[PDB]
Symmetry: D2
Subunit: 334 residues, 4 copies
């Protein structure tokens, strides 16, 4: 058993906890740090507006929750430096607060006794950034200690980008992600540093910067400076699509583009990238464990320009990717 702690028991933190329970046989969450009190925190674990009721018994007290009869230690420190992960023999900490995406801050978990930190977002000053299935072979068990699992969008874009770059060569490309609203958007028109994300999320198409097409550079260095993009946040609670338009010197058809993805989407890579010819809408990919679900029916080719669209559950799909990377960290030296 490799012992895991979660810092930030929000959407991704709670997704991750459920993923551990459902898909892991060698990881165990033993400690959680979060701003919520234990009554709220256990309630939100038990009941989920997206995932439904947890399949296990949940109780709490002043210092813990207990899930399927396993006591889990719970803290409420604003500052990671006041945690003690060593006290519980925690090896890996999932940093999913959204406020410690700077590795120089997330480093504090390691001072506090953790061996590894995996940031559940694009980071700064990180040892390394990973999309599982794309660049995880490059993980250095000795020197990669505070790492990033990238964004939901990057985990969708990169697997497909890699396949098509390897096969046909991408010269330039621009991305639009049409993406479920997230918790940092406001419910009613209200204060936000981003004036568009200020705006009532459930009744607006909300453009917002993404970053997660340039972040492909960190994971596919071949594509540095060749990809850019942005998001339109729209009123669905989870489920997103990445629409990539790109040029290639290759001679391509709809058919050959699609066949390139079909032939890659196999074996273990095929757990990251799926290939579909089904008449998909967003609800069909909710709770899909892939990082990227390629939609062959949406491929277009105009000369040397190609549009391709891949789906992703930005919550569960990303989390499943984050867990694959967590499994890789645990299987190697700590």
């Amino acid at each position: 058993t490799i012992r895991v702690g979660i810092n930030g028991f929000g959407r991704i933190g709670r997704n991750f906890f459920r993923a551990v329970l459902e898909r892991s046989d060698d990881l165990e969450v033993v400690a959680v740090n979060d701003s919520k009190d234990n009554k709220t925190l256990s309630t939100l674990l038990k009941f989920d507006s997206i995932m439904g009721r947890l399949g296990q018994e949940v109780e709490y007290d002043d210092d813990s929750i207990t899930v399927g009869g396993k006591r889990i230690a719970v803290y409420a420190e604003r500052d990671p430096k006041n945690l003690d992960w060593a006290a519980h023999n925690v090896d890996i900490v999932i940093e999913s607060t959204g406020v410690f995406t700077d590795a120089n801050a997330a480093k504090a978990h390691i001072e506090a006794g953790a061996k590894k930190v995996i940031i559940s977002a694009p980071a700064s000053n990180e040892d390394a950034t990973f999309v599982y299935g794309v660049n995880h072979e490059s993980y250095d068990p000795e020197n990669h200690n505070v790492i990033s699992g990238a964004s939901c969008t990057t985990n969708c874009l990169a697997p497909m980008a890699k396949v098509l770059n390897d096969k046909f060569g991408i010269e330039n490309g621009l991305m639009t992600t049409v993406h479920a609203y997230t918790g940092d958007q406001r419910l009613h028109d209200a204060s936000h540093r981003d004036l568009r994300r200020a705006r009532a999320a459930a009744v607006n198409i909300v453009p917002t910067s993404t970053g997660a097409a340039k972040a492909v550079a960190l994971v596919l260095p071949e594509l540095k400076g060749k990809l850019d993009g942005y998001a339109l946040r729209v009123p669905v609670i989870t489920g997103s699509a990445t629409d990539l338009t790109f040029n290639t010197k290759s001679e391509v058809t709809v058919e050959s583009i699609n066949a390139a993805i079909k032939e890659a989407a196999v074996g273990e890579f095929g757990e990251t990238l799926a290939y579909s010819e089904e008449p998909l809408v967003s609800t069909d990919i909710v709770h899909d464990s892939h990082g990227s679900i390629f939609d062959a029916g949406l491929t277009k080719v105009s000369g040397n320009t190609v549009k391709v669209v891949s789906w992703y559950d930005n919550e569960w799909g990303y989390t499943c990717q984050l867990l694959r990377l967590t499994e890789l960290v645990a299987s190697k030296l700590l």
Copy 2:
């Protein structure tokens, strides 16, 4: 002109600003305090997801906005004791932050040079609480200085409860308000004191307590102890209905219940309480200026048990009620 200040430039603050421009010819908002920086504040004033664009030009600088060419002083003081309303010759302050509903706290506005404060919600320790059209005749210009305009729901329930109580006598009633989600609720399942309001607001029916039915007693003491209720928050952005089920000893029919409202919903009171026989849905009462829009088509009677239903725009309707109350205050003496 009576000059007005707004503390808390949120949904209700901004509705109130627009209501003054559209509906008043004797009030002017000359100063605003809020948490936002001027870029964000002017932006959220210019653009509204519910109300659409402001029909006036908006500009901003380091300590003001300019709206239709009128300069409005803007502050970002989290503590109202750090404001000065007398500096801008402001008589009345709307207290719409939602964090100063204790009148002892809201009194800071009086010490900062305002003559009157109107709290845009239920209050504690207040001089007086009003639903316009129901009990505004009791307003005492000398002694009611920090006052409450009640809640959106109380402004919908009280007009209707008064009419039916006066005509038939209400023994006991219980209310459900089916209510647009509001800013207190969470977009995604996340931290909240209320474990239900914690839950993703736009995909859930969310039960939550109000106090709006017990608060009717403040404006109609005859109904002390006779009403209670709760809310179900549902995925519409604004627009709400209050569904009241009560017992009467009177012999009543659907027709006599409806006739009672129709009779009453006239003149100045009719600006607060409307009577409708139209096939209404919530979008039909968005931007309606009444506190209470009685839906005759929904009334039911089973023996001595009556169900009546009244709609309200919890933003705009409540705001129009608050503006009526503000106009009253502004028409009577304003001394320190």
Copy 3:
């Protein structure tokens, strides 16, 4: 196994299909009639915006779908007198089109070779109406051949009204159900015989008439004349709540009201009616198998006036009740 046919492969028909696969050990759906072509019908079985993907393989051809290797004959006859259930040895037909709730139309299934018809809605001219767990004991296998499983709302209201009526006595009560939009409503403001249901469903609170409180009287004749109500359709895709306000001559408290349901919600009956003290919102009762989930936190009392509130998944909850009714029918004489 008893062989079942479905007429009307819509929300309820497809829920029913999935419920049979998941919850039944003695029933098999062998034949479906619907307006859709096989491609469309198979697509909507496999993919569901509410229930997610079906966990079985789905294939189709010119006059069948095949689900987890089981061939299912498919028809598209507007008029059921043009069907033939006997050719598939179908005993029970679930009548879920929404358009044949008059038993005088629905009985065409019997003429077409079925032995029993269960209508997925309030009916007219029917042999009997049932809410499972409330009055199914009155089922007459000889004379009850074209029956109704009543409405989603009645299946929520009736169990709770029964318990509270039995204990305290209901003088009169009025109901509001705050209810998920349904397929009868328009997406955009458009033609409808009901000028409120005409209005854009996903952005409106929409009042609409339900006969579901008065229909409790079919199932609990003690309450005839004593109940009425209406619905407010609101923008969630499934999941609903029935809010009942009634007066009683008994002296009652929030605790005694809650205790009466908790007491009752225990056995077989407890599969129909649950008692919850949880902080429920609508998403928490989506895919719940109960007819009625009583929310003890929402009980209020003022003098002799009582308000109680119960949740239901108007799709799956109702469907599980219909399945319970079907199992009872399947367990007795099919002459």
Copy 4:
């Protein structure tokens, strides 16, 4: 005054009715044909889930509605051959039913006494297709009698495309339109010829095809064969964006792309194409009169590849383009 009839009093028809009242001083709608009784029709005119209440008073009788004192004759003829527009001295008919986009059906309005038919959609067999601001100067009052006002998407894309093609030259481009759901989509998972449009509209992102990028060729022949695209329908009731990604041989920057739109979007053409540096979301362009609202903050450039985004109210914005076209027709020869 030039008198106008509307055939198809749906979303676009009723938007058009309101646009005339709000924005025209020289047109009057004097007759309407739809599928509805006058109570139903008057209700849906008076009350709108998107546009709010009509400001004018609305009465009806067996033969008509009266709006602000003006009697408007109403018909419910399925087949336009059975109308008589000449009896109402109607010169121009708006064909907004959606079912007569073949000009050889639409021309029945002319047999029925009208002089001009404007189809509120892509058409077939038409005399001409127009995006106001782009190609309306080619309108020929003698020979252009059954015409198309193109699609919502085409009225957004073509103005932006013309400016950038004129300045920099577009070699090829692919577009994605992120589009409010429309009446054709289903509220619950249900029958549709499009297996994705079958899927509950207000909880799904729904890919669907549009010919709107190819149809730019009818209005800008230079761009024939160069553009294609598709749509993602999303849960907002109105308001859309068109995202075009294109290659040019020109040397361009974000700044130079944006500068080109800004210098074009002035004068009369600027009532069709607006230039914005505001932090726009979809609700900010609801009831916006422009065909195309270019969002300078979303422009991206990677080498010789450009992404530009333009907003449109697919209801009101399109309708305002249609009214511009109608005003032009009304201003020139009517036989």
